[PDB]
Ligand binder design. Structure first.
Ligand SMILES: [Cl-]
Ligand SMILES: [Cl-]
Length: 162
């Protein structure tokens, strides 16, 4: 198991524009297109992202390409972030995957806001961190996925994904 397989399990793969859990236009492996309600604003972003007229449909390869960019950007955003970098540096390899997963789902700003949990993670207070991470809109809105990520932080193994 690695970050790619992990996020592939959490996000799924869809080759046609769809609506995410929040109701936003997305495609592929969790690639957010726009927060705008317009399907046309979505098709426009989609074509700009792929470099071809897609008519809202892409191939597996195209989807994986987007996914490769998104993970890369997630990591790089963590490394450039003053609040995130120190947490990431402190973690072991599995727990690092858990943080990258939160960032991919919610963006750097979103994660950087989990001040208290971040502090607990850095201090390696696993059980306490898991408890605080659960008191969030995140956990309430997508409980199955949140539980998987939280378990990864608590244990430091890939159990929840096996
Ligand atoms: Cl893009
Ligand atoms: Cl869920």
């Amino acid at each position: 198991m690695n970050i790619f397989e992990m996020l592939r399990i959490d996000e799924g793969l869809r080759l046609k524009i769809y609506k995410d859990t929040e109701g936003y236009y997305t495609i592929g492996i969790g690639h957010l297109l726009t927060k705008s309600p317009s399907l046309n604003a979505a098709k426009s972003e989609l074509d700009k992202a792929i470099g071809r007229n897609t008519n809202g449909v892409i191939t597996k390869d195209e989807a994986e390409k987007l996914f490769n960019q998104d993970v890369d950007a997630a990591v790089r955003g963590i490394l450039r972030n003053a609040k995130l970098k120190p947490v990431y540096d402190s973690l072991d390899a599995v727990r690092r995957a858990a943080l990258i997963n939160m960032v991919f789902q919610m963006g750097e700003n979103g994660v950087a806001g989990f001040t208290n949990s971040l502090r607990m993670l850095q201090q390696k207070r696993w059980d306490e961190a898991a408890v605080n991470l659960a008191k969030s809109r995140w956990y309430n809105q997508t409980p199955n996925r949140a539980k998987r990520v939280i378990t990864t932080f608590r244990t430091g193994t890939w159990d929840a994904y096996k």
